[PDB]
Write an enzyme that holds these catalytic residues in place. Structure first.
Site, mmCIF file in Angstrom:
data_model
loop_
_atom_site.group_PDB
_atom_site.id
_atom_site.type_symbol
_atom_site.label_atom_id
_atom_site.label_comp_id
_atom_site.label_asym_id
_atom_site.label_seq_id
_atom_site.Cartn_x
_atom_site.Cartn_y
_atom_site.Cartn_z
ATOM 1 C CB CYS A 50 -1.025 -0.039 1.160
ATOM 2 S SG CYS A 50 -2.102 1.425 1.119
ATOM 3 N NE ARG A 108 2.398 0.504 3.579
ATOM 4 C CZ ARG A 108 3.453 -0.190 3.668
ATOM 5 N NH1 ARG A 108 3.897 -0.540 4.855
ATOM 6 N NH2 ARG A 108 4.288 -0.206 2.575
ATOM 7 C CD1 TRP A 162 -7.331 8.959 -1.862
ATOM 8 C CD2 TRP A 162 -8.473 8.964 0.248
ATOM 9 N NE1 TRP A 162 -6.663 9.728 -0.849
ATOM 10 C CE2 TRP A 162 -6.918 9.518 0.291
ATOM 11 C CE3 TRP A 162 -9.015 8.994 1.638
ATOM 12 C CZ2 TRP A 162 -6.475 10.014 1.457
ATOM 13 C CZ3 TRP A 162 -8.719 9.610 2.571
ATOM 14 C CH2 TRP A 162 -7.405 10.056 2.676
ATOM 15 C CD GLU A 176 -5.922 2.409 -6.696
ATOM 16 O OE1 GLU A 176 -6.494 1.420 -6.282
ATOM 17 O OE2 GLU A 176 -6.010 3.438 -6.132
HETATM 18 C C1 HEM Z 1 -6.675 6.301 1.916
HETATM 19 C C2 HEM Z 1 -6.020 6.195 0.685
HETATM 20 C C3 HEM Z 1 -5.428 5.028 0.108
HETATM 21 C C4 HEM Z 1 -4.821 5.075 -0.704
HETATM 22 C C5 HEM Z 1 -4.583 6.198 -1.678
HETATM 23 C C6 HEM Z 1 -4.454 3.712 -1.139
HETATM 24 C C7 HEM Z 1 -3.441 3.080 -2.340
HETATM 25 C C8 HEM Z 1 -3.318 1.653 -2.578
HETATM 26 C C9 HEM Z 1 -2.868 1.308 -3.951
HETATM 27 C C10 HEM Z 1 -2.587 2.442 -5.140
HETATM 28 C C11 HEM Z 1 -2.674 0.110 -3.569
HETATM 29 C C12 HEM Z 1 -2.525 -0.722 -5.013
HETATM 30 C C13 HEM Z 1 -3.987 -1.252 -5.492
HETATM 31 C C14 HEM Z 1 -3.834 -2.060 -6.791
HETATM 32 O O1 HEM Z 1 -3.214 -2.000 -7.537
HETATM 33 O O2 HEM Z 1 -4.926 -2.867 -7.059
HETATM 34 C C15 HEM Z 1 -3.140 -0.384 -2.430
HETATM 35 C C16 HEM Z 1 -2.979 -1.617 -1.951
HETATM 36 C C17 HEM Z 1 -3.277 -1.926 -0.606
HETATM 37 N N1 HEM Z 1 -3.921 -0.942 0.259
HETATM 38 FE FE1 HEM Z 1 -4.215 0.966 0.297
HETATM 39 N N2 HEM Z 1 -4.656 3.105 0.083
HETATM 40 C C18 HEM Z 1 -5.202 3.762 0.857
HETATM 41 C C19 HEM Z 1 -6.056 3.271 2.109
HETATM 42 C C20 HEM Z 1 -5.911 2.196 2.572
HETATM 43 C C21 HEM Z 1 -6.601 1.739 3.573
HETATM 44 C C22 HEM Z 1 -7.689 2.348 4.547
HETATM 45 C C23 HEM Z 1 -6.363 0.250 4.009
HETATM 46 C C24 HEM Z 1 -6.669 -0.715 4.767
HETATM 47 C C25 HEM Z 1 -7.430 -0.350 5.708
HETATM 48 C C26 HEM Z 1 -5.302 -0.109 2.847
HETATM 49 C C27 HEM Z 1 -4.808 -1.659 2.547
HETATM 50 C C28 HEM Z 1 -4.187 -1.963 1.239
HETATM 51 C C29 HEM Z 1 -3.681 -3.241 1.049
HETATM 52 C C30 HEM Z 1 -3.931 -4.259 2.037
HETATM 53 C C31 HEM Z 1 -3.381 -3.375 -0.243
HETATM 54 C C32 HEM Z 1 -2.888 -4.430 -1.056
HETATM 55 C C33 HEM Z 1 -3.972 -5.445 -1.371
HETATM 56 C C34 HEM Z 1 -3.051 -6.594 -2.175
HETATM 57 O O3 HEM Z 1 -2.243 -7.115 -1.786
HETATM 58 O O4 HEM Z 1 -3.777 -6.951 -2.992
HETATM 59 N N3 HEM Z 1 -5.051 1.048 2.002
HETATM 60 N N4 HEM Z 1 -3.274 0.891 -1.567
HETATM 61 N N1 7LN Z 2 -6.837 -12.005 -12.417
HETATM 62 C C1 7LN Z 2 -6.543 -11.028 -11.548
HETATM 63 N N2 7LN Z 2 -6.904 -11.976 -10.305
HETATM 64 C C2 7LN Z 2 -6.193 -11.421 -9.070
HETATM 65 C C3 7LN Z 2 -6.061 -12.655 -8.195
HETATM 66 C C4 7LN Z 2 -5.637 -12.619 -6.972
HETATM 67 C C5 7LN Z 2 -5.449 -11.150 -6.397
HETATM 68 C C6 7LN Z 2 -5.657 -10.138 -7.394
HETATM 69 C C7 7LN Z 2 -5.077 -8.764 -6.729
HETATM 70 O O1 7LN Z 2 -6.196 -7.680 -7.072
HETATM 71 C C8 7LN Z 2 -5.641 -6.170 -7.075
HETATM 72 C C9 7LN Z 2 -5.066 -6.098 -8.470
HETATM 73 N N3 7LN Z 2 -4.753 -4.442 -8.622
HETATM 74 C C10 7LN Z 2 -6.815 -5.638 -6.896
HETATM 75 O O2 7LN Z 2 -7.025 -5.334 -5.178
HETATM 76 C C11 7LN Z 2 -7.966 -4.077 -5.107
HETATM 77 C C12 7LN Z 2 -7.430 -3.072 -4.330
HETATM 78 C C13 7LN Z 2 -6.743 -3.406 -3.302
HETATM 79 C C14 7LN Z 2 -6.432 -2.424 -2.279
HETATM 80 C C15 7LN Z 2 -6.344 -1.202 -2.669
HETATM 81 C C16 7LN Z 2 -7.017 -0.946 -3.962
HETATM 82 N N4 7LN Z 2 -7.225 0.700 -4.443
HETATM 83 C C17 7LN Z 2 -7.538 1.597 -3.404
HETATM 84 N N5 7LN Z 2 -7.574 2.856 -3.670
HETATM 85 C C18 7LN Z 2 -8.324 1.093 -2.201
HETATM 86 C C19 7LN Z 2 -9.198 0.190 -2.017
HETATM 87 C C20 7LN Z 2 -9.619 0.118 -0.528
HETATM 88 C C21 7LN Z 2 -9.017 1.200 0.064
HETATM 89 S S1 7LN Z 2 -7.800 2.211 -0.810
HETATM 90 C C22 7LN Z 2 -7.582 -1.699 -4.832
HETATM 91 C C23 7LN Z 2 -6.142 -10.221 -8.690
HETATM 92 C C24 7LN Z 2 -6.222 -9.707 -11.881
HETATM 93 C C25 7LN Z 2 -5.663 -8.674 -11.285
HETATM 94 C C26 7LN Z 2 -5.382 -7.474 -11.978
HETATM 95 C C27 7LN Z 2 -5.899 -7.654 -13.262
HETATM 96 S S2 7LN Z 2 -6.465 -9.169 -13.540
#
Ligand code: HEM
Ligand code: 7LN
Ligand code: HEM
Ligand code: 7LN
Ligand code: H4B
Ligand code: H4B
Ligand code: ZN
Lengths: 407, 411
Positions: free
Chosen positions: A106, A109, A278, A283
């Site tokens: 993330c 953070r 947000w 993204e």
């Molecule tokens: C407040 C603004 C926030 C921003 C701008 C942000 C930004 C991001 C971004 C860009 C990612 C990559 C997501 C992707 O490519 O799918 C990410 C991943 C993640 N963030 Fe955040 N985040 C925020 C808040 C949070 C909050 C509030 C939490 C938890 C309470 C959190 C937990 C996570 C986790 C667990 C991942 C990785 C999930 C995975 O491994 O697939 N984030 N964050």
């Molecule tokens: N086939 C898939 N399957 C898949 C299987 C296992 C794991 C994943 C991982 O998913 C992430 C790919 N970028 C999406 O997770 C959504 C995410 C998580 C945390 C933050 C994100 N964005 C934010 N701004 C926040 C969401 C909540 C708080 S901040 C989005 C994907 C694909 C992934 C991407 C393209 S296809």
């Protein structure tokens, strides 16, 4: 043992000790690095419980006070007896916050300590879960001034009674294949979309149909619910200088809210713990819009721009990519919905890494995910060495509930 | 043990067995991944097995494993090691070794080309003036009037650690950097230090923005010597843009031949500390890194000013807009002058085909995702969505310390 990380743009060197607390494994060995891989009893629980309460009581300057010893005692009593235990609210809040703090992937953070925690452990039904969720959506949306938050449902017990939200995010668009053979809407959700149809969701069969929630309380079969449209803030995408842009018919939703992860605190597992903050602009504009297996619109935008699409070396894809991302940011900003650009976010995350090195002794950081999907080397995360490792409390992946559930 | 890697765009799954031949360490453990860290005198003792492994590999490559020629070569190498303490590679084994060092280079996106490498054997070289002559022939062969050809030249291997052949420059062709009293830098900031060494040693600095550095060449553990490359041999390209006429007025240019001179080549336990190699450029290396890194020429501001973008807020993406134009300019200029170059769409697409073919013929392809993915437009290149496995095979290319930090001056 003590490790050094260098920023190669600024020569700043940080020393990492926090990693020596790492408990969980990474997937890597001394022979093979696996950094680009997307996913790699009563006996067990007390150790985990003690590890957590020690860091909680340390965090509040009471490590080695009667209050600490007594809690260690009380929870220990409770485990030997019930085979589980319960967190105090204060422990809960700390643990959810810290699970964000420890999320090595993330970029957001710097915000970790502003998290509203909604305790939903009292919930018993899907209708309850729907209530709690809609309240979370409305709180977090805050008419466009978005606020971070997590809603926590009852923890796993014997694993025949899991609470689950089957949606991957609370708010996502429908995906449909056509006889045609191409895809209408968002191809990432095709399978879930047909799951909802198979349960009886009448589908508008549009490009941008908000999906119904599918909720499982207490291990039961899950049920459909339409989030009230009034609660789903959406943004029409236009460009600040290309008038034709709006006629592409693009919109996106304001609130990203992940709902398929498992939160582990002090040995306890919270299988439903939907959380939102947000969006960073890329993204949406780089990933949701341009990925080949997503809305995949680069070709059509390039056309409207009248760019030379004969050769990859005209960099028409890259030109189109930038303008799309300008449009996403401009639209959100124009409509006053919170969004962050990738420049500002990574500048932020470097400030934060530096805080956590100073106050905590490090920061687990996954460079593969932290570096944005456009303009890599012109953001500062690119030139920053990061150490990735796994700390608890933590969010973790879990298997899609349809592959596991029984009807 | 079998390992799978998936591509998430295509759902192509690959299987890896090649990593079972890996022996060198990654830097990672079960508790820490070190995958973004830039960089995580041999005795008979350690030498014979290293030699044996290499010749077992060389001999299966030619389908003569277990053959009489294979066995006799082992006995000959062995006896030479324990009498002379080291050994000499045959030409053929040196070729095959250098080809495999490239092939095993997990940070190289251009390994599709691995089998096409012209190997110059400079192991009869004794002096620095000898080195200059071999380097100059390299640079002319490889340049080939703009139709670039991959080459490597290989000076004598290390013996006692006190008679090393080094090329002190980091690339054979690179521009000077000059720190000014006001604290600004004229030319290329990355080469300020090396530039300072060259001045100290005697070079008169033209003191401009694109001065080609002289070669600083150490033979046989000797103090190094200064040579100028004949400019007629230095192919360079003025940078202009196809629509913006003001681009040329920025005074940019760059050289066409990239040639790495500071890496150590290891083959069968042997250490070849001078092994300059050259290929051609992916466009982003110049357009993104060389021009637009903050610590390099840093032209983003001045390009966006000329484009009159809204620079008052980052969320205009005025940087990402300027970055793209500059990259278009770099590819346009090189193609117009008929100098070989490859863009990042085409380079990454080729790699992904290479990588699949390799998984098929070889059982794997070590690959460093942090390096392979380009520094712009990451996710719209197919490598971004390819899971990769990084492990280390020999033969290989390695870093070594800058020679000004270890060298024993004679005077
Ligand atoms: C407040 C603004 C926030 C921003 C701008 C942000 C930004 C991001 C971004 C860009 C990612 C990559 C997501 C992707 O490519 O799918 C990410 C991943 C993640 N963030 Fe955040 N985040 C925020 C808040 C949070 C909050 C509030 C939490 C938890 C309470 C959190 C937990 C996570 C986790 C667990 C991942 C990785 C999930 C995975 O491994 O697939 N984030 N964050
Ligand atoms: N086939 C898939 N399957 C898949 C299987 C296992 C794991 C994943 C991982 O998913 C992430 C790919 N970028 C999406 O997770 C959504 C995410 C998580 C945390 C933050 C994100 N964005 C934010 N701004 C926040 C969401 C909540 C708080 S901040 C989005 C994907 C694909 C992934 C991407 C393209 S296809
Ligand atoms: C033929 C065209 C070639 C292209 C387009 C190409 C492309 C690249 C690029 C873009 C990099 C990353 C460079 C950086 O970020 O600074 C790279 C790394 C590398 N390639 Fe190539 N390559 C080519 C030929 C070769 C040749 C001939 C060799 C050696 C025989 C070689 C060995 C390497 C090595 C060792 C690295 C990584 C160096 C490091 O760790 O610092 N490549 N390749
Ligand atoms: N202080 C540094 N120095 C530094 C110290 C240790 C390692 C490195 C890594 O070196 C590479 C940085 N990009 C430079 O390598 C140049 C290179 C290597 C291989 C291929 C390259 N490009 C080609 N197309 C070829 C060259 C020769 C055959 S193909 C370029 C750099 C910095 C790094 C980042 C900001 S400053
Ligand atoms: C294979 C590769 O690890 C995978 O595509 C990753 C790369 N980096 C990423 N980074 C972010 N932030 N989100 C992602 O979905 C991915 N995908
Ligand atoms: C710290 C980080 O590993 C470093 O900035 C790396 C990232 N990826 C790279 N990738 C390539 N191709 N070249 C580089 O110099 C780097 N720099
Ligand atoms: Zn690793």
């Amino acid at each position: 043992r003590f490790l050094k990380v260098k920023n190669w743009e600024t020569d700043v060197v940080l020393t990492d000790t926090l990693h020596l607390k790492s408990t969980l494994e990474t997937g890597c060995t001394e022979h093979i690095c696996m950094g680009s891989i997307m996913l790699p009893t009563k006996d067990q629980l007390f150790p985990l419980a003690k590890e957590f309460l020690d860091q909680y009581y340390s965090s509040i300057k009471r490590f080695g006070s009667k209050a600490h010893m007594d809690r260690l005692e009380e929870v220990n009593k409770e485990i030997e007896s019930t085979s589980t235990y319960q967190l105090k609210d204060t422990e809960l809040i700390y643990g959810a916050k810290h699970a964000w703090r420890n999320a090595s992937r993330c970029v957001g953070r710097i915000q970790w300590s502003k998290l509203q925690v909604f305790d939903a452990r009292d919930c018993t039904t899907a209708h309850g879960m729907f209530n709690y969720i809609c309240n979370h959506v409305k709180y977090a949306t805050n008419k466009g001034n978005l606020r971070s938050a997590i809603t926590i449902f009852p923890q796993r017990t014997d694993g025949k009674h899991d609470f689950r939200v089957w949606n991957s995010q609370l708010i996502r668009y429908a995906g449909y294949k056509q006889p045609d053979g191409s895809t209408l809407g968002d191809p990432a959700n095709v399978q879930f979309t047909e799951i909802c149809i198979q349960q009886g969701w009448k589908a508008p069969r549009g490009r941008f149909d908000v999906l119904p929630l599918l909720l499982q309380a207490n291990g039961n079969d899950p049920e459909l619910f339409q989030i009230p449209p009034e609660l789903v803030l959406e943004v029409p995408i236009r460009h600040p200088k290309f008038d034709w842009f709006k006629d592409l018919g693009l919109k996106w939703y304001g609130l990203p809210a992940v709902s398929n992860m498992l939160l582990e605190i002090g040995g306890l597992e919270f299988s439903a713990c939907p959380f939102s903050g947000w969006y960073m602009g890329t993204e949406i504009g780089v990933r949701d819009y341009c990925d080949n297996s997503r809305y995949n619109i680069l070709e059509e935008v390039a056309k409207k721009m009248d760019l030379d699409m004969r050769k990859t070396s005209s960099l028409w894809k890259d030109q189109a990519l930038v303008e799309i991302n300008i449009a996403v940011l401009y639209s959100f900003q124009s409509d006053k919905v919170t969004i962050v650009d990738h420049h500002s976010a990574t500048e932020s995350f470097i400030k934060h890494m530096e805080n956590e090195y100073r106050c905590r002794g490090g920061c687990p950081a996954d460079w593969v995910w932290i570096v944005p999907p456009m303009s890599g080397s012109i953001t500062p995360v690119f030139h920053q060495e990061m150490l990735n490792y796994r700390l608890t409390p933590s969010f973790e992946y879990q298997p899609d509930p349809w592959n596991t559930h029984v009807w």
